[PDB]
A paper describes a structure:
The type 1 insulin-like growth factor receptor (IGF1R) is a class II receptor tyrosine kinase (RTK), belonging to the insulin receptor family, that plays critical roles in cell growth and differentiation. IGF1R and insulin receptor (IR) are closely related, and share 57% sequence identity and high structural similarity. Each IGF1R and IR protomer consists of the L1, CR, L2, FnIII-1,−2,−3, transmembrane (TM), and kinase domains. Two such protomers are linked by multiple disulfide bonds, forming a stable, covalent dimer.
Numbering used by the authors:
A (entry chain B): 4 to 37, 41 to 63
B (entry chain D): 1 to 153, 162 to 189, 193 to 260, 265 to 294, 301 to 510, 515 to 526, 532 to 558, 562 to 645, ...
C (entry chain A): 1 to 35, 41 to 158, 162 to 189, 192 to 210, 212 to 256, 263 to 302, 306 to 625, 671 to 706, ...
The structure:
Amino acid sequence: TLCGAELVDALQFVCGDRGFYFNKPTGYGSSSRRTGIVDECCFRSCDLRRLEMYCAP
Amino acid sequence: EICGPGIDIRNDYQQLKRLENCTVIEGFLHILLISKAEDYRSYRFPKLTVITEYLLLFRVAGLESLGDLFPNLTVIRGWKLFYNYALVIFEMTNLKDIGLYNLRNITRGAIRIEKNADLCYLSTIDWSLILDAVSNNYIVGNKPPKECGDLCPCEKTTINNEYNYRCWTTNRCQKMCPSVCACTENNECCHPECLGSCHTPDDNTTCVACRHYYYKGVCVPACPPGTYRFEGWRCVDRDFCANIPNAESGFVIHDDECMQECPSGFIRNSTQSMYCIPCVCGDEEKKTKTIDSVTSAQMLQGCTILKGNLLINIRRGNNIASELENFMGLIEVVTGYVKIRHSHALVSLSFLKNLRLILGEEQLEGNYSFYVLDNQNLQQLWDWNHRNLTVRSGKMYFAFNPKLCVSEIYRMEEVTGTKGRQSKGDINTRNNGERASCESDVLRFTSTTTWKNRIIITWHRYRPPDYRDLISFTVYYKEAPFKNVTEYDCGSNSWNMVDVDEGEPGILLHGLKPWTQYAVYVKAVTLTNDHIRGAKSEILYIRTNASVPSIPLDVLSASNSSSQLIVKWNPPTLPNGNLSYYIVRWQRQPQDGYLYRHNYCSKDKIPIRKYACACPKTEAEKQAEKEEAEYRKVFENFLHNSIFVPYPFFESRVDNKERTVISNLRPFTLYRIDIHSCNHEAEKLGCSASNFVFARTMPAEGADDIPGPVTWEPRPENSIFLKWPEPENPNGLILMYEIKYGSQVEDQRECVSRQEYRKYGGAKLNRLNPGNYTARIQATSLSGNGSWTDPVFFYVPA
Amino acid sequence: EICGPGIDIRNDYQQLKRLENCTVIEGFLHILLISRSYRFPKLTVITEYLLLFRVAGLESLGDLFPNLTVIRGWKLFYNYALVIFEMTNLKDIGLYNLRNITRGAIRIEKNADLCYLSTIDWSLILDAVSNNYIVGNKPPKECGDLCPGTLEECEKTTINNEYNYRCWTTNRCQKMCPSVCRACTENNECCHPECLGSCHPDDNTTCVACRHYYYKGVCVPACPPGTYRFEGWRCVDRDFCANIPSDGFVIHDDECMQECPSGFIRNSTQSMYCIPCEGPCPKVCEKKTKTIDSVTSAQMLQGCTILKGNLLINIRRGNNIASELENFMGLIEVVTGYVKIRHSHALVSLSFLKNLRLILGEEQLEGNYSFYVLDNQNLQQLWDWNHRNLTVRSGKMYFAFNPKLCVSEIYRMEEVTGTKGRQSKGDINTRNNGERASCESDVLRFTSTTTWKNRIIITWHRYRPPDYRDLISFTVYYKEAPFKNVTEYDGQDACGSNSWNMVDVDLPPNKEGEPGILLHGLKPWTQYAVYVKAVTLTMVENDHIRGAKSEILYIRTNASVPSIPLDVLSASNSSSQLIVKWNPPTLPNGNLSYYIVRWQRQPQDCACPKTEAEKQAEKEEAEYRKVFENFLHNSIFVPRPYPFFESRVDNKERTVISNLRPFTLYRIDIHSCNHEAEKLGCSASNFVFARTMPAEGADDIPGPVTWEPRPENSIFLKWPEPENPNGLILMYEIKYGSQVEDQRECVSRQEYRKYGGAKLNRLNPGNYTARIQATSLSGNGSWTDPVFFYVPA
């Protein structure tokens, strides 16, 4: 399990150069479907496999 | 130039180029996760001056200050906050200061700056002149103060206690505006449609960034008809909102605003979808929706039907209640349970005004429906005879909530028709609202009394609604020097309780400090349905009988001169009654006759009279310490039990100070000085006991001189009797006489006692060799040497 | 004539005449706060202490007590025998006949005129002198008393290596009876040593205070078996005390004692005899309830281990309750009816009850309740232990509304009390009892530690909660603990300041800097006991909060060097022999081994408290940062779709030394080694001088003093200089005359050596004679043969 700042750096250590993925908003609907991370990796443990889901392509 | 609806600076320093163009940032501004791996080239961006909504900074390694990046940022209105805030900077290394001089006015949120010790110049800049809710800001965790000590290169206004250098860096300073008002570059309140500053005063167009709306270079407080109110900062045409790319998946004109959705029952008119005509939010997935911050709540605005749950908890802040009302009020109906925990600024749930119909379908454990817990400063449920409320199912619960009234729950269970549902546990009574109750029956004190140490209180005998309720009593009390005291719940003087059960019910408090204004009041404890009442009572004051005072202290004294004595002391540690005065007595002291009784001329040595961390206390030490204290205690216990009526003595009555000067005294004499405190109640009580002191008056120096000419005479075998008078007032006591004499130098030295001097009237050295001779005398008083008197001559021939 | 039982005197000088009749005081003697001329020659001997406090207007003491001779100090006063305090205008201690102060030690302080002090020995009137207390009198440079003789004295003596006479007041002298035998009388007769003080010689019926006992006018060391001792001095027959005025003074071991001591109880059969039993004095104590609220209201229960009824414990608050609360009640064995504790908060654990073994409940409570506890805010720990053969045999137990006690503790109850199947099932309402305690925990461990004689460094493991962020601010406790029967609930009674000193460490700034601590300000060779508890801050509760504490650990500092031994004093039983007395040390700093003694002749001519109001305040902050944090991550990221000699004082505080030279000084040093000096080094130093004072055999010249018919009329008294005078001659004194020596010759050695004799010139012809008493280092004692320098014509 990882939480806290121990999270953020770890993600760099999995991303490094590639950066992160962001779902860019364009037309600014006054709404958004926003389940996150500490729900996942700070209540149970998560693998270095699924972290790619957040790293940029 | 404007831009919308948001910027996402992330991982790509280069990406910053997206701010090349505009100055009105509609939406938000994210700047996050920028490693300093790329070198800093000072990408200046001057055109930008205002952003509608929040500004976020997170982990941009490689930035030193802010002005370098943002010179012209002046105002951020903050329409949609970011967790109750407007600008937040978090986890920033490299960052030395906030060069944001141009900012003057920020409207809605608060500033949260945290966990960046890499920076200082914080305790300088005043915000209160920018925004209002200073008590909602949050700044700690940056570099400790005693390592910063920064000094400006400007104006100085008290920062809540005192003024200092208010400068946004070592190169700029905090602007301001005098009491003229808007404001201009040089001291003038511009056209009142302004915000921040104006180029030139009093113009509809030259204002740097004008408030309250925007339109076609003009600043209006009310848009024209063809226009509409857009994003709380501008006015628009029909066509523009008709061409907006909603991408919500054209805005609806309503109340002259381009709002995207519509309240209940307001549907896109047939072929006028651009307008809503009159003829419910939440998802089935989560089934619950916590509410902590305005963002977590503003994203709920505009609903009346609700499905899911209402978990609510808020940790701190100002009247968030205002805002939560300004949104949640539209809610009427909820399916699932309602639950509250640890909330602290929820003075009263009044903001859920239009809720009437609760389902409580998906109940909590124990099939619970209405659930509160531990919320401290909640004092009143909105349940009043206006808002009825029909809880369908489930059960209730309350616990620990100390500011509501234990009868409000009763009106609640009334209105909701569940008075035959829950047990004594399911709605606790031991520990809810107990720290402040509403109201109950009054009681009356039968009679008081007072000795010097004890007191017997009698209240009026109470009678309950149903007599088989054992109506016992408690009696709260303490010392009270004042009246700025509550009554409600040891150590640092908090309280002390006592219990008590055909005579009138009274109680006896005992072993009390004399003359201490105790405050007392009784409280009714029941011994048994919610048909309980109890009964509070009145805050009664009582001052216990006076008592004999305690001896003074600090007893010190000296002589600024002969027959003058200065003595300073300490008021008693236990006056025990309004102070009246002190008494001072004194006595001469008979000189030590043994000096008389035993001549010390022959003695080889003569006497003289001087005048006028926390290392934790271990166990073994503490033992003997307590024993010593007990010893002194059992010792002075005797002297404590004595009265005292107010060479002879000579008295005094000093009242004002604790120090006094005494006259009319013989010079250089030993005196002793009894002292007493004396309260104003010793008329029949008796004045205080005694603590003494010693002192010795000042020389007298100047009287050890022989009071005349020293005269000689010759005799048979050469015995020269000398005649010199005794100095009548010796400095204390005269012992002997230094007698120098001789042929040419008075090198030979002679000692002369006081017996022979009283035996003959002088001294006489017998069988002296002839020649020319002269002699001198010095005295030997108590203070010291005498004075080597005049050489007088005598020549027994050869 | 007896005189008892005590004497209280105050505010009435005339009340003094309450002494007119009696001669021996059988008790204490207080004198306090009197506003003339009185004498009391009857008083001879006391048995209890004697106290004088602020009685102004008194000349001396003996003028009020001219025959106080011995004070046997049988009942002290705060470990004292004679105490003076604040006696203005008291010039001098008039008591000039006190002889053998038995037990206590003097306590004299703050008196304006109590001179004539150093001129009084203590070593010949009591035996523990160095426990005295003398301060605040006339500083020794301001009176300078004299002694009866301005011309000639009584005797002078040594103490602390100096000379002066021994006189109480300017008209009395202290009287050492010489080493003739050793009990004495006036005029130096050897009395029958079985008496004490004075003797009116070898008398068993004519003395003042029979030492060691008294009976029927006869000194005696053991009175006959019908005569039982009494008050430490006098015996009486059997019926006497019985007929003396709760029964009288029961008989035990030849004593008629007021209360026969511990380890017995009265055989009601002849109730004046008490038999030793096995139990610790089973004493009993109308109604069945007995409330307790504070420390006092228990007073009427101290000791009676068996109570006929119940207990209702209701304490709101107070001082450090548990200690003395237990010391009052801690002896109860078996209470009859029920036990109940309600609304009482200042309690933390009920351990203060030591010996509750059987609780029978013959008076059950409503619905057959025997054990009832209810709404106690701060109770955490029941004495139900790994160390109780507690037994209950009636009534159901009951528990309600006590947060700080988790159900797992009370669960072990019935399986150690044998009351399992008796209680109902809704009693332990696991809803509330034990909510907010913390009895499940993760256990810390230790890593290492180092122990300097006065500093300790300890380091423990690194903790890692299920979540990293949860604050870790370790809090460490220790206490001085000479044993092992100790666990962490002693003073933590909402006060907490009794038996656990506590300090706080903070999280290390290093990411991996292992957190340990140094402690200072310690006591060498004194076993400490420490442990450390991990202060979480938050609801790490999955069901209830976790918390984490170490397990208790004992330690002791490395040993170290002893300190200076105490009270190096010494007396000469004879010349050329010296006996030493000194006091064992103060901080042995380890098992003592032995002492070191040497002698040598000498030549000729940053506070660390935690403001709790900030403490919990600090919790929320780091807590508040927690929740705010998670919102950040929850909204940013998004997934893709001069020689000297030495001896070994080994066991005793007293050793002689032999074969010296008389009247020769000696620096005396005692050193004391622990069992550690062999590798560390031995004591510091303590010095004292003690001249083996002589011996008048060699004061006069034992060689013949020969005159000489000289040139122009003169007499040369050539006595040879004695080879070994009693040390040496200061100056010679030759009384000379016709046939009765009429004048005296004064000859210093400065005036003798250069001569080697004595010359008297220009004599009137006619026969003469003389004699010499050379003032030697032993003084002018024995006289020479009266020399005959007859010079007739």
